[PDB]
Amino acid sequence: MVTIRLARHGAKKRPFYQVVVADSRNARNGRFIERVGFFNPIASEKEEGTRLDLDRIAHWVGQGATISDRVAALIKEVNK
Amino acid sequence: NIKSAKKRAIQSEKARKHNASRRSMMRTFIKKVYAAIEAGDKAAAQKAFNEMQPIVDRQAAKGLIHKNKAARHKANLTAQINKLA
Amino acid sequence: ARYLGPKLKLSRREGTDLFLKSGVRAIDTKCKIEQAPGQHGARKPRLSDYGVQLREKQKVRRIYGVLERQFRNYYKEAARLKGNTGENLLALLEGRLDNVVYRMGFGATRAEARQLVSHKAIMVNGRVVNIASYQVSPNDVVSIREKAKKQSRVKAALELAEQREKPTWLEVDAGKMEGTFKRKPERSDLSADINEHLIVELYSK
RNA sequence: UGAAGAGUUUGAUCAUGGCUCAGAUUGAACGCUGGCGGCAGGCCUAACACAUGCAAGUCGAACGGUAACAGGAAGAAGCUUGCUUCUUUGCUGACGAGUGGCGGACGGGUGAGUAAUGUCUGGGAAACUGCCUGAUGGAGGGGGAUAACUACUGGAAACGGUAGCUAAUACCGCAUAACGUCGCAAGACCAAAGAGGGGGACCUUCGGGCCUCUUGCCAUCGGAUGUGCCCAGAUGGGAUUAGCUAGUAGGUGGGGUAACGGCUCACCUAGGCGACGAUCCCUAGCUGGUCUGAGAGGAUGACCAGCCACACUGGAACUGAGACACGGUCCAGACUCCUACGGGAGGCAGCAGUGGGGAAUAUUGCACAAUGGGCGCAAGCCUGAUGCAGCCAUGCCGCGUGUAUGAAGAAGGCCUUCGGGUUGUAAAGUACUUUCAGCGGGGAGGAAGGGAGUAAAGUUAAUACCUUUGCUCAUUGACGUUACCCGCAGAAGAAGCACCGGCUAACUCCGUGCCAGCAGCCGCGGUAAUACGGAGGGUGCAAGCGUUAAUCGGAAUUACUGGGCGUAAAGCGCACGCAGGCGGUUUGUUAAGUCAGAUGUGAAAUCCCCGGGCUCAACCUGGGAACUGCAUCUGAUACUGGC
């Protein structure tokens, strides 16, 4: 199953997270098709914090890869 | 707790007594079709091949030889009855 | 390290006032620097061929309270953007937060100024800074925390700062204890107790 | 916007040739000393061996059912006729165990083997591809097994064996079936499951006929992404290994795999491979990376990201979408453990301790709080995954140990034909300064949501299901004594170690008297020891300082950038010459090689530029760049090879 999922990225007591498209299948943050964004749970309360390639995701969903509840909710942080 | 891999050799040997037995039956069926070419020619071979055709598909319907070998057997022998003059 | 030992014996051995333990009894005579000529000869019997720049290298370190490894790193960063180690090197030492707290007058000595910075009492652009080597730039605002603004030595240090030479490249207000950097210090004013052929080949010499 | 040189052959000197020192360094170790905090990393050795416990489950919204709990359903009695007892019961909420579906090859630990079918980097053809995702088809009928339970039974047991009995989203046939099968094509053939929540008229024995949405089940053919295969360019030592080989080298016929080839067999052929080092033997995780210096170059690849291999020692491969299976099978070997003695369990190079090995490498810590994966339609359950503490100058970075005052200069110490000098603003005495630590209180956020409220003129039959918003109630914090703020606190609790004849910074006096104790080289010590031990004063760095076996620099003294052969060290005593290296010149042509232009690729971290986040920075990153490479297309047409 090709899935659009959040990947393990950050520091001790400071998680950051990236989002990638991959068959899973593959292990943790590796061997991915392409990157589409980053979360940053803090994002310093600013509009230049958190990014998501909503148009490349629109070509990778369909008729494409799966997107689950917690990842389909990333659009709510960029709002949008 | 469980480890269901510990069941799979017993589940394979208990099934082997039909799932490998039918491999011997299928190796034999090729002999029955070539024996129907000497019985013989177009008025025996294609009548006898139609005893094998459904058994190959009915085995492939369960897995085991489904990826290529089932259709390979049918194509190989269709070409051998089509060769007749 | 801060050496922590007796101070005036260093300046007397360099024949040069290092501003160590300066103020009050140290102004107008009785510092005794270059007043003990010895009973026979210059006591240079001998003495070492590399004594310059070697003692000049300790002088330029000790007079700012700067350690070897950091002074060697200053000699490397000073070369960038055509800055020249005969110009930018001295302007980097004069632009230190411990020298800026000393030139704004909140410390009577560079040691006293460092001991306001490290003891969490100083701010740069409203942010608390404890790094004495922080480089103050031509837009930076330097000030003291409320817990220290009324300290005895800080008020006494400003009574000496008005008798010292004015640093024209900065501004300060003593009633708020807040000042601003307006220009980088320049060699056409910034002058030091060092000879002109020395510390221009620093390290590997 | 970077890049010390020198010493040593002598009575002197210029060369050359070796050797040596002054600087960096490690997963280190050693000595003395050692605070506050932060970022990393932490058995390199026995691929030696493991105590005691864990590390992997889940579904009652498929199903037979029920050891218990609780409510219904049904009988028998007391006479106290209104309060109780007795005898039964999956009908139902729920669920122990049982059937059945799915998961455990998620994601860790370790280099033993292999100079490679292996990493890095670029291609090719003959195949498969569950779940995801896309389109197109299909769902009638019959029959047989079996667990749990119970009664028997092997054995001292551990551990479960058997029989009687019964059902399917467990199983097989009989049916139906596409653009699939094969062919120019008509066409024949192969399969399977329902289930759940909601809900009206008609009817009953009212534990469903029937409507409705959801989600499954069986098949055909594409995408998406992997898996299997073969090549090319890159590549440790050895020639006092020069020859090696019998599936080695080519053909003919079978079998094998999803597919290929000698892949595996049986037979015909004798070739194949070698100085560009074949054959054989020793050593060995590889590269992103790391250290060094101005770089080139050198020494080297822990951790890190990715890839390939390994699971006590060894074989076979099987299951499944996937393992050439850490917690699997059949076990065998070496073993530990149990057995009072009739056979039985297992493999910490997981998480942690421990025996051993070592100069050496951290606690059987805390927690399902956060997150992921797994099962479940979902509530929810599992998780030594994971997320965090704990310890260590082991490397790197920010910071304390006080500050102010104070002398014709003290007492005490050192040096001195004893005048004087120096330790020294140092001390005491008197005041500041509470940074760091200590100590009490206040105290975030990391935690969203399910149930209820909500909200769309939701879905529909207007509160199921399904679906939406920001908030409330109640439940969810290991880290933790959090961060941060406020106060109580008093100089209080806080400094080392090496060095001082010449090179070489700082040096004098005492004692020892060639002895003792030293030394990078020249060399020290017999009455002035600047060389030992001390003492007084200086030099150096600092929570560090130092000593070593060694690697990089100095080192152009391994020489490519960039070595040398008359003698100092190497030119063969000589003649000819195969295989190698090299070769005038006019034309065309080939395009191996060069130069020019593109499209792919050169993983992510990361250098360097540069925007955020903590002061700077280690670190987490957001955007750029480079990695001159390599392939595939295409020009120039000059030189080299070729003809």
From Swiss-Prot, chain A:
Please list the GO biological process terms of this entry. cytoplasmic translation; ribosomal small subunit assembly
Q: Which residues cross the membrane?
A: none
- Which SUPFAM superfamilies does the protein's record reference? Ribosomal protein S16
Q: What GO MF terms are annotated?
A: DNA endonuclease activity; four-way junction DNA binding; structural constituent of ribosome
Assigned keywords, A-Z: Endonuclease, Hydrolase, Nuclease, Ribonucleoprotein, Ribosomal protein
A Pfam family annotated for this chain is: Ribosomal_S16
Function per UniProt: In addition to being a ribosomal protein, S16 also has a cation-dependent endonuclease activity.
* Assembly information from the UniProt record: Part of the 30S ribosomal subunit.
Q: Which family does it belong to?
A: Belongs to the bacterial ribosomal protein bS16 family.
* Protein name, UniProt field: Small ribosomal subunit protein bS16
Q: Where is the organism placed in the taxonomic lineage, from the top?
A: Bacteria, Pseudomonadati, Pseudomonadota, Gammaproteobacteria, Enterobacterales
UniProtKB/Swiss-Prot annotation, chain B:
What InterPro entries is this protein classified in?
Ribosomal_bS20, Ribosomal_bS20_sf
Keyword line: Ribonucleoprotein, Ribosomal protein, RNA-binding, rRNA-binding
Mention any one GO cellular component term assigned to this protein in its UniProt record.
cytosol
GO biological process terms on file: cytoplasmic translation; ribosomal small subunit assembly
Which portions of the sequence form the region Disordered?
Answer: 1-24
GO molecular function terms noted in the UniProt entry:
ornithine decarboxylase inhibitor activity; small ribosomal subunit rRNA binding; structural constituent of ribosome
- The keyword Hydrolase appears for this protein: no
Q: What family name appears in the similarity comment?
A: Belongs to the bacterial ribosomal protein bS20 family.
Q: How does it assemble?
A: Part of the 30S ribosomal subunit.
This chain's function reads: Binds directly to 16S ribosomal RNA.
Q: Entry's PANTHER family?
A: 30S RIBOSOMAL PROTEIN S20, SMALL RIBOSOMAL SUBUNIT PROTEIN BS20C
UniProt name for this protein: Small ribosomal subunit protein bS20
Organism in which the protein naturally occurs: Escherichia coli (strain K12)
Name the gene that codes for it: rpsT
Swiss-Prot record, chain C:
Q: Which Pfam families match?
A: Ribosomal_S4, S4
Q: Which GO terms describe its biological process?
A: cytoplasmic translation; DNA-templated transcription termination; maintenance of translational fidelity; negative regulation of translational initiation; response to antibiotic; ribosomal small subunit assembly; ribosomal small subunit biogenesis; transcription antitermination
Key words, A-Z: Antibiotic resistance, Repressor, Ribonucleoprotein, Ribosomal protein, Ribosome biogenesis, RNA-binding, rRNA-binding, Transcription, Transcription antitermination, Transcription regulation, Transcription termination, Translation regulation
- Sequence ranges assigned to domain S4 RNA-binding in this UniProt record: 95-155
Is RNA-binding among this UniProt entry's keywords? yes
Sorted alphabetically, which Gene3D superfamilies does this protein's record hold?
A: Ribosomal Protein S4 Delta 41, Chain A, domain 1, RNA-binding S4 domain
Any one Gene Ontology cellular component term annotated for this protein: small ribosomal subunit
SUPFAM superfamilies assigned to the protein according to its UniProt record, in alphabetical order: Alpha-L RNA-binding motif
Q: Which CDD domains match?
A: S4
Summarize the protein's role. One of two assembly initiator proteins for the 30S subunit, it binds directly to 16S rRNA where it nucleates assembly of the body of the 30S subunit.
Self-association and partners: Part of the 30S ribosomal subunit. Contacts protein S5. With proteins S3 and S5 encircles the mRNA as it enters the ribosome, which may play a role in mRNA helicase processivity. Some nascent polypeptide chains are able to cross-link to this protein in situ. The rRNA transcription and antitermination complex (rrnTAC) consists of RNAP, NusA, NusB, NusE (rpsJ), NusG, SubB, ribosomal protein S4, DNA and precursor rRNA; S4 is more flexible than other subunits.
Matching entries from NCBIfam families are given as:
PRK05327.1 (NF003717), rpsD_bact (TIGR01017)
Q: Tell me the protein family, please.
A: Belongs to the universal ribosomal protein uS4 family.
Q: What name does the UniProt record give this protein?
A: Small ribosomal subunit protein uS4
| Species this protein is from | Escherichia coli (strain K12)
